Design a protein around this nucleic acid. Structure first.
Lengths: 106, 251, 130, 193, 173, 204
RNA sequence: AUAAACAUACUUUGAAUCGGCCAAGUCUGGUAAGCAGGACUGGCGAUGCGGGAUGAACCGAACGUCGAGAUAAAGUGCCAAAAAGAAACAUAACGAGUACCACAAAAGGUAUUCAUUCAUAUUGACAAUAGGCACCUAUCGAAUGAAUGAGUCCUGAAAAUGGAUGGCAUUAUAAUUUCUUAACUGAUACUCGACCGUU
RNA sequence: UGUCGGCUCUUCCUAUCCAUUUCAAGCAGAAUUGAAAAAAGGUAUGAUUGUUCACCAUUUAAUAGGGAACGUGAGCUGGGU
RNA sequence: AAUGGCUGAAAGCCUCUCAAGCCAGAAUUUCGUCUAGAUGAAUACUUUGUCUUUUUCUUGUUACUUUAGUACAAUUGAAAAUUAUAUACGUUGUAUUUAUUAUCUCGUGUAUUACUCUAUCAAAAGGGUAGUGAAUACUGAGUUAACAAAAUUUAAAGCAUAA
């Protein structure tokens, strides 16, 4: 119908050389090449929507989502920190995450 | 510490690993380098070894002190009955070596060649090349064959004839023929396919391939010996008589 | 032979910083990397400052009778006499500079008409050739 | 240190025509055409006009210019400029390399081929092996006189190598070269005209 | 790099309290400027901070940071062998700007870190007193050179994509 | 969404180790890469010293069993996969999955010769190199170390250049006519209202 | 002057322990030693955490269970979280690349960069050409010659399984030396808050 | 942690003995001497001694020097200790 | 490779190059030859023609059997080479994912297509010819939406026959 989101790549969690903090996930929004273009996205919704091959004998949804918020910039290359309701699965590394346009501030 | 005395190593590492082959026929791993300024010709044949005799040969070489009465040499006898060409295949030079393109086969195929495509012939329905033969003369198949001929002349660089022997002319109990791909070294690919098509179903004699006083290469499979020890396999030195647990081993 | 030279009086175009896409004039060459641009502050707003050659681009205009260390008064006279602003706007870069400013004021409705109109015009131009 | 600009040029006499296409100079003159490729990524070659005499007129000159660059690089401006001078000279007055033959006791026979694109050296120091020595495309060997030959050609790089190729095939081995002064040498290098 | 004007006096038995020691010190900040100033007094006049009072430590700014001048820095540095006096010429628009050039040139050509160089004096020379072979080529009025092999300039990091579509070209610029 | 597209990288005039760093980083970001012409890459060093480095590389081999030792692939398409594999996580599912999305081919095979090509400005030899430095093509080094198929690619590329050359001219005429036909309807009076809109925004 | 009331002064009973080891802007014996023995201090032993790839001692910092934030040593081409710009001597080489640390010397080079001193540089210095190897003449017209010092480079540089700037790789760097920008990344240490226990 | 030497066998180093390619000599030839590339190939038979070592008699293009837990004892021998 | 040379600057001369560019030169290196060898390719017959899983028969495999479920042809993706790139311009300043005006109905013909399909010549082609459909421009007009719903991407049981 229409595209109302910008794809972001789940690069990985906030980490160090030999540590990992899955509370915060790092995202690379498409088209953001510097930390000065991040102020717009600080606070926008982010959704990790995935597909699960459920059986017809069940009632669980076949398309489930985990939502979260962009909270702060991370580095000088337009990388952001996102905190979700549940920590992202490491199986979803490098997949696409929808960066919505709400909560709007215009 | 270094070895006291230096001696050459036993055996050759150019042949390791020493794995026994599976098929009796030995596929030649190369062919003489092609020259495009000559009449196309076959570059190989296939024969069955019969035995060895010895011939007294008069020496024609000069500046040699060999006796005038004639030297004594051993000679092997390789019976080579005529082989029947039953098709031809083109090859193309790609970035992963030669890649066969097609294989245009003859209308009539002997039962010897049919036996190669089965493992229990006496139980088979023996329907090899049945569709290829009964539908050979259709307009659809004839047009398809012309496409295969035309494809080779445009996108190929190597032509080989799928020639097979005739088991009926030898004392061997084997009935299924032996199939060999013989390259056609000669002119351009346009006249190679023309030569190849002219050879379909036509028997080729050995004299057509090899001439007189011709130096050739032979590829075959050596005589089997089964499990063997270190002494026979590599020629190592046998141990002194006093040795405990045995003599014929590498210490 | 190269056409554009880093000389005294050569008109250069700023490519980064606060004065990106603004004209400038070289009036000094300190070394192979640093030049003193004095694109008239009263005309284009570029202050008399030293800039690195990696930040500017050459153009096809040179202001006549410009000597090294020219004052802002005499340099302003030579800049307007050559009509540099008039000639620059007819160049490929000049039309590209005004395009960037022009397309930057579009709204959502503005981009709607252009996308619809041009897509119809472009399709029609394809029909006109057979 | 780094030179801001190094300028060298060569003068074009009225008989030769020079056309440059991306550092690829072709020079055609009365004797023939010579082509070369100066694949140096830091030189600009362009035909122009420049006064070269203190009180003389303007003439046609091929100009080679190297801008900011170290002394390791600026040394190639004179090298490339000299090569075009030899290219200009080669097609105007071809080069010749008079080569003489020296032997002690064994006479040497030079069997020059009919066309002149090959030679043959026989019985050098009483040897049975025959030295053939081919020639580059564009170089011709001729027999000037007795125990003397000359090489004719347009390219001084092809001629000199062919002249040196013949000498390098006739070196005395495992012997005192201060006494066995044998082989084909080079007397002098000059022009055909 | 900033330049400071520092004055002080010594009030004890050895020194009369009427001699004022002035200086012009190039330091990253004003704390370092006093530190440099005190060591000059301690190693030359036996004056220590415990027996001296500072008077004025004011910054010095360039009167005309728009005029190109040729400088001549006289300095002494310490090498592995011994101590040497060197004179270097620089082209810049500010006195503090040229000093940073000298520090960066000394630390690269001579591998001499900052805590070996002492700046004796810095003056301004004419257009013909320049003796540096490279710098002597840029003092004339008729100097021009085609800046070539330019990498295309990006307006800002905003448009700096990692992967670009189409061929990449340099510029005759 | 799912990025099913493939980013075709034309490795001509690039640096072997600078392409790999950009590609290997973006392979972990769920991107499918296909590097065409992985033998046109440039490595710093003349052919003399580049063979010395290869000579040292071929020395590393398991002494007790050469068939277990390091396998030295001479093909340039395999001299880039090894370089890329060195910058990916080793011995984990993340690194194995990010390498299955990479391909070099020596020439330009049937599907990848008509896709849009992309370049890496961080890896171009015209940006990261001194022009006086001598480099070495991977294909040129491949023959020196025993890559047999350096003549098939040179011939196959040539017939691809003379196939696209005639396609380019055919489309040049088609695009010239369309551009001249668009200018006709842009100047028509019936289309004045639409052109007035475009002229305001600078499109026309 | 500063600090100190869960301060200060203790009393009684008693456990374990007296094989030690390491660092050093330290010393003695020894050719030297990851050798032997000492003065002062700090550590390991008894000690995890972040960094140096890996390491008892090195650097930061010592630990109840957590949430969020600035930080430390140190890093910002990929493995690996995080940088962009500026100038130079390096690099045609298994040269350079994170201290303790896991090696290199004397010496030589018309290799290269900078600086100092001296002489010749004009109507004419050197090289070249021609004339009467040194010397003088004309053209050629702008730098030339000599010494010394400081950096970098090359030689000096040979060992045994195949291999180690950590690896891939880089080469007007993705190396080195120094900078600029209210740049960034990051510990169980610091700040705020919540809960558990001791005083 | 089976403590010398010898036998059998493989591999590695070059600070090369020979063969291959080179430069220098107080290198006429022959025979040599000094040095560079190069470790892919070869480098022996016996009297005495447990000997490593040594010293002899030959043959050879040469009869080079070393490492691998002073390679190698669920491989041998047990001559020495 | 060592080495000997060619042209040739730096350094007007000289010089094999601690410069660009070449030649000759080893029991050397790589092709060529030999042995083992992975992913593979061609042809012959048995099939199948949107797709899968769980069972299940066989020494084993394939086709095969039953009950389902799912989609149904029609705008995606290519100049090459060089970079001191002949001249002119510098065409500035966001690569893929990610560029269609909600759906349906009535409308006239023309034109276009790296569009689909049919036939033919060819062809290891974003091929030629003819025909048909689809979308678009000329270019309209008309209905409907409110609350609900707008997910396939994979399931479960068998062995009659043939190779």
């Amino acid at each position: 119908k229409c595209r109302l989101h910008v794809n972001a790549v789940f690069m990985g969690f906030q980490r160090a050389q030999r540590n990992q903090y899955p509370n915060v996930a790092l995202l690379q929004i498409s088209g953001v090449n510097t930390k000065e273009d991040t102020p717009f996205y600080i606070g926008k919704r982010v959704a990790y929507v995935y597909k699960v091959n459920v059986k017809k004998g069940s009632n669980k949804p076949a398309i489930r989502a985990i939502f979260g918020k962009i909270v702060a910039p991370h580095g000088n290359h337009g990388v952001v920190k996102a905190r979700f309701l549940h920590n992202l699965p490491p199986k979803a590394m490098g997949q696409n995450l929808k960066v919505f346009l709400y909560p709007s501030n215009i | 510490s270094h070895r006291k005395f230096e001696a050459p190593r036993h055996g050759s590492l150019a042949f390791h690993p020493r794995k026994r082959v599976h098929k009796v026929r030995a596929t030649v791993s190369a062919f003489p380098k092609d020259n495009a300024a000559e009449k196309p010709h076959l570059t190989g044949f296939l024969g069955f070894k019969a035995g060895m005799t010895h011939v007294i040969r008069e020496v024609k070489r000069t500046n040699t002190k060999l006796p005038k009465d004639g030297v004594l040499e051993p000679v092997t006898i390789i019976e080579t009955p005529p082989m029947v060409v039953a098709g031809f295949v083109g090859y193309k030079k790609t970035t992963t070596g030669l890649k066969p393109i097609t294989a245009v086969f003859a209308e009539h195929i002997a039962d010897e060649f049919k036996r190669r495509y089965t493992k229990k012939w006496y139980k088979n329905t023996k329907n090899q090349f049945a569709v290829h033969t009964e539908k050979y003369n259709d307009v659809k198949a004839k047009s398809k064959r012309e496409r295969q001929i035309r494809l080779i002349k445009n996108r190929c660089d190597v032509v080989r004839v799928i020639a097979h022997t005739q088991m009926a002319l030898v004392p061997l109990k084997q009935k299924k023929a032996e199939v060999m791909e013989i390259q056609i070294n000669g002119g351009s690919i346009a006249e190679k396919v023309d030569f190849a098509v002219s050879l379909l179903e036509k028997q080729i004699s050995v004299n057509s391939v090899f001439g007189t006083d011709e130096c050739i290469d032979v590829c075959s499979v050596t005589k089997g010996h089964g499990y063997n020890g270190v002494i026979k396999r590599f020629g190592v030195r046998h141990l002194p008589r006093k040795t405990h647990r045995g003599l014929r081993k590498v210490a | 032979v190269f056409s554009r030279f880093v000389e005294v009086g050569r008109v250069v175009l700023m490519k980064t910083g606060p004065f990106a896409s603004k004209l400038a004039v070289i009036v000094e060459i300190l070394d192979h990397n640093r030049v003193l641009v004095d694109g008239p502050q009263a005309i284009t707003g570029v202050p008399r400052q030293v800039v690195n050659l990696n930040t500017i681009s050459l153009t096809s205009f040179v202001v006549n009778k410009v000597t090294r260390g020219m004052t802002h008064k005499k340099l302003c006279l030579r800049f307007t006499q050559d009509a540099i602003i008039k000639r620059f706007n007819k160049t490929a870069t000049g039309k590209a500079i005004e395009k960037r400013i022009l397309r930057e004021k579009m709204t959502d409705f503005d981009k709607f008409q252009v996308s619809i109109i041009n897509r119809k015009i472009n399709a029609a131009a394809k029909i006109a050739v057979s | 240190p780094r030179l801001l600009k190094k300028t060298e040029h060569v003068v074009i006499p009225e008989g030769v025509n020079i056309e440059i296409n991306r550092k690829n100079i072709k020079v055609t003159g009365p004797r023939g055409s010579l082509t070369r490729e100066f694949q140096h990524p830091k030189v600009d070659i362009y035909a122009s006009k420049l006064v070269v005499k203190k009180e003389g007129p303007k003439e046609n000159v091929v100009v080679i210019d190297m801008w900011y660059g170290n002394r390791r690089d600026s040394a190639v401006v004179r090298t490339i400029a000299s090569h075009i001078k030899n290219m200009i000279t080669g097609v105007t007055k071809g080069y010749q390399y008079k080569m003489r033959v020296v032997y002690a006791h064994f006479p040497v026979t030079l069997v020059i081929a009919d066309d002149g694109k090959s030679i043959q050296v026989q019985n050098f120091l009483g040897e049975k092996r025959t030295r053939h020595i081919e020639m580059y495309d564009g170089v011709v060997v001729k027999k000037l006189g007795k125990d003397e030959i000359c090489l004719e050609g347009n390219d001084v790089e092809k001629v000199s190598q062919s002249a040196a190729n013949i000498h390098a095939a006739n070196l005395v081995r495992n012997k005192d070269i201060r006494q066995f002064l044998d082989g084909v040498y080079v007397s002098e290098k000059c022009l055909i005209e | 790099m900033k330049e400071y004007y520092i004055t002080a006096r010594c009030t004890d038995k050895a020194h009369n309290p009427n001699e004022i020691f002035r200086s012009r010190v190039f330091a990253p900040n004003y704390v370092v400027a006093k530190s440099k100033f005190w060591m000059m007094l301690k190693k030359q006049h036996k004056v220590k901070k415990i027996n001296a009072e500072l008077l004025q430590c004011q910054p010095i700014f360039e009167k005309n940071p728009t005029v190109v001048k040729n400088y001549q820095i006289f300095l002494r540095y310490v090498s592995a062998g011994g101590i040497h006096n060197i004179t270097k010429q620089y082209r810049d628009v500010t006195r503090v700007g040229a000093v940073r050039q000298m520090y960066n040139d000394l630390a690269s050509q001579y591998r001499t870190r900052q805590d070996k160089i002492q700046l004796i004096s810095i003056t301004t020379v004419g257009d013909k007193a320049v003796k540096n072979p490279v710098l002597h080529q840029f003092v004339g009025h008729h100097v021009k050179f085609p800046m070539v092999h330019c990498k295309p300039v990006i307006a800002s990091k905003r448009f700096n994509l990692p992967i670009k579509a189409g061929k990449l070209t340099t510029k005759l610029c | 969404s799912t990025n099913n597209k493939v980013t075709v990288i034309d490795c001509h005039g690039h640096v072997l180790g600078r392409v790999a760093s950009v590609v290997a980083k973006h392979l972990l970001l769920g991107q499918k890469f296909v590097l065409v012409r992985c033998e046109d890459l440039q490595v710093c060093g003349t052919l003399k010293m580049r063979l010395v480095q290869w000579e040292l590389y071929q020395r590393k081999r398991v002494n007790t069993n050469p068939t277990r030792g390091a396998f030295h692939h001479r093909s340039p398409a395999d001299m880039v996969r090894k370089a890329v594999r060195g910058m990916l996580p080793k011995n984990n599912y993340r690194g194995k999955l990010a390498l299955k999305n990479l391909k070099c081919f020596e020439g330009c095979p049937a599907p990848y010769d008509k896709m849009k090509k992309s370049s890496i400005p961080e890896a171009a030899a015209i940006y990261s190199f001194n022009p006086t430095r001598k480099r070495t093509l991977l294909g040129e080094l491949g023959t020196a170390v025993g890559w047999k198929y350096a003549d098939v690619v040179a011939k196959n590329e040539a017939e691809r250049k003379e196939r696209a050359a005639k396609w380019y001219a055919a489309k040049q005429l088609k695009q010239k006519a369309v551009a001249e036909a668009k200018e006709k309807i842009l100047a028509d009076e019936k289309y004045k209202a639409k052109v007035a809109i475009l002229k305001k925004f600078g499109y026309a």
